[PDB]
Amino acid sequence: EMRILILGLDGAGKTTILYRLQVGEVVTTIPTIGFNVETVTYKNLKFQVWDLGGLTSIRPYWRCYYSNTDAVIYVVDSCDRDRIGISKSELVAMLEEEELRKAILVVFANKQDMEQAMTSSEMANSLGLPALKDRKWQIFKTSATKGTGLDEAMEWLVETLKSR
Amino acid sequence: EGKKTKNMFLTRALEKILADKEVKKAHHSQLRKACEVALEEIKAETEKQFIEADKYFLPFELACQSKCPRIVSTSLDCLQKLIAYGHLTGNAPDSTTPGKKLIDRIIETICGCFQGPQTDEGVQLQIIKALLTAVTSQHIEIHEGTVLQAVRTCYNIYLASKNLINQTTAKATLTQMLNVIFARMENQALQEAKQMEKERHR
Ligand SMILES: Nc1nc2c(ncn2[C@@H]2O[C@H](COP(=O)(O)OP(=O)(O)OP(=O)(O)O)[C@@H](O)[C@H]2O)c(=O)[nH]1
Ligand SMILES: [Cl-]
Ligand SMILES: [Cl-]
Ligand SMILES: [Cl-]
Ligand SMILES: [Cl-]
Ligand SMILES: [Cl-]
Ligand SMILES: [Cl-]
Ligand SMILES: [Cl-]
Ligand SMILES: [Mg+2]
Ligand SMILES: [Mg+2]
Ligand SMILES: [Mg+2]
Ligand SMILES: [Mg+2]
Ligand code: NA
Ligand code: NA
Ligand code: NA
Ligand code: NA
Ligand code: NA
Ligand code: NA
Ligand code: NA
Ligand code: NA
Ligand code: NA
Ligand code: NA
Ligand code: NA
Ligand code: NA
Ligand code: NA
């Protein structure tokens, strides 16, 4: 019933997150080429969750799937300091798209389980989240390899959908 | 890195099939048998010791031919994960088949799960996903007749589908599939030309 996209640069952890939400396991993955789509249930709204590839050549296809999208989970590698400017560049592009005007944004600072990770604040800055309006959003520290963050982020997201 | 993941997909999918209601019936008995037999081998070889997926296509082909959308979806999703992770290459040609291989038969089975507008919408979606993966997979070599079939099926789903999400997906899938196929053709031409330039130098 509710359409959810998972977006972000390649390697960010989108697919791992996907199956961590669906069946609570760490799956071994390949770089996504064609989309993945799964039914996910967090108590208790029905979710159709889409997982597209973040390779450079696949990113232009993202907007082909923005139609009727209720919410976006945007996943960022907390250890990818070199490329965080690109996640911003892409996050900016997509939130300029008319088909996403009323979509809820949730950022996953992923791979938080690693010591080299940037902080929530530093990342929220570099992604220019404060300058966002009129946008409903929140950033969440996560590790998809472990369990940290997912439940808090989903609960927020779920409440935020209800509320709207 | 050598992976367990292949096995989980194969076995969990088979189990889900065997666990489904309408498969208990004698009406799906062949399917039931196929799945139990396949399982009996994969379990028997996984406690010992590579598992080769190519050998176990029969239960999925049969599941695809089922009259129960649930069975078909589960089958289609498993095939997409199999092809994607490169566990299901399909590089063995059946008898009358050549110049065609197991993979063309797999894509054809996928395409045949679409019977027109009346086809279940979740199965439709599953068909789009699996075809995209198949056609964009760098592992496998697909006959162009099979390519055109993949293409025709997505476009048919796009025309006939009542579900807008499915239509749009079909649309986006066609563009990517086509762009990939052409990119791949141009690159193959490049490699051939390069070899030929190299041979030119006796
Ligand atoms: N340490 C750590 N590694 C992670 C985490 N999440 C994912 N990874 C790893 O990072 C790599 C990328 O994982 P994926 O989920 O396939 O990344 P993706 O976002 O789907 O990337 P694309 O499919 O190419 O768009 C994999 O090797 C994962 O094992 C995490 O939370 N912590
Ligand atoms: Cl268009
Ligand atoms: Cl919003
Ligand atoms: Cl599929
Ligand atoms: Cl047809
Ligand atoms: Cl239907
Ligand atoms: Cl094209
Ligand atoms: Cl020669
Ligand atoms: Mg990265
Ligand atoms: Mg992936
Ligand atoms: Mg992915
Ligand atoms: Mg739910
Ligand atoms: Na589990
Ligand atoms: Na809808
Ligand atoms: Na880095
Ligand atoms: Na704007
Ligand atoms: Na409008
Ligand atoms: Na306003
Ligand atoms: Na919580
Ligand atoms: Na069993
Ligand atoms: Na069995
Ligand atoms: Na063996
Ligand atoms: Na399924
Ligand atoms: Na050829
Ligand atoms: Na749909």
Resolution of the structure, angstroms: 2.3
Q: Is residue B149 within 8 angstroms of chain A, CB to CB?
A: no
Q: Do B154 and B170 form a contact (C-beta atoms < 8 A)?
A: yes
Longest dimension (CA), chain A: 38
What are the residue ranges spanned by the domains of chain B? 1-202
Q: Do A37 and B173 touch (CB under 8 A)?
A: no
B111's tokens: 């395409």
Q: Is A143 in the pocket of ligand 1 (CB under 6 A)?
A: yes
Q: By C-alpha distance, which of A91, A49, A78, A72 is closest to A157?
A: A72
In our burial notation (b when 16+ CB lie closer than 10 A, e otherwise), range A66-90 reads bbebbbbbbbbbbbbeebbebbbeb
Chain B: closest CA distance from residue A143 (Å): 20
Rounded to 5°, the CA angle A122-A71-A3 comes to: 145
- Ligand with the closest atom to the CA of B167: 25
Q: Do A7 and A1 form a contact (C-beta atoms < 8 A)?
A: no
A23's tokens: 């069946």
Between β-strands A2-7 and A71-77, what pairing exists: parallel, antiparallel or unpaired? parallel
DSSP of A38-83, one letter per residue? EEEEETTEEEEEEE---STTTGGGGGGG-TT--EEEEEEETT-TTT
Between β-strands A104-110 and A36-42, what pairing exists: parallel, antiparallel or unpaired? unpaired
Distance CA B72, CA B113 (A): 8
Sign of the C-alpha dihedral computed for residues A27, A37, A49 and B172 taken in this order: positive
Domains and CATH numbers, chain A: 1-164 (3.40.50.300)
Rounded to 5°, the CA angle B156-B184-A27 comes to: 80
Distance CA B174, CA B158 (A): 9
Instruction: Look at phi and psi of residue A138 and say left if phi exceeds 0, alpha if psi is from -120 to 50, else beta.
Output: beta
Task: Identify residue B166 by its one-letter amino acid code.
Answer: N
Q: Do B134 and B107 form a contact (C-beta atoms < 8 A)?
A: yes
CB atoms within 10 A of CB A42: 14
Q: Do A37 and B5 touch (CB under 8 A)?
A: no
Distance CA B149, CA B169 (A): 18
Q: Is A22 in the pocket of ligand 1 (CB under 6 A)?
A: no
Distance CA B65, CA B109 (A): 8
Distance CA A40, CA A19 (A): 9
Distance CA A26, CA A18 (A): 10
Q: Do B168 and A28 touch (CB under 8 A)?
A: no
Residue A148, Cβ density class (10 Å: 0-12 exposed, 13-18 middle, ≥19 buried): middle
The tokens 């749009």 sit on which residue?
B168
Experimental method for this entry?
X-ray
Distance CA A85, CA B144 (A): 41
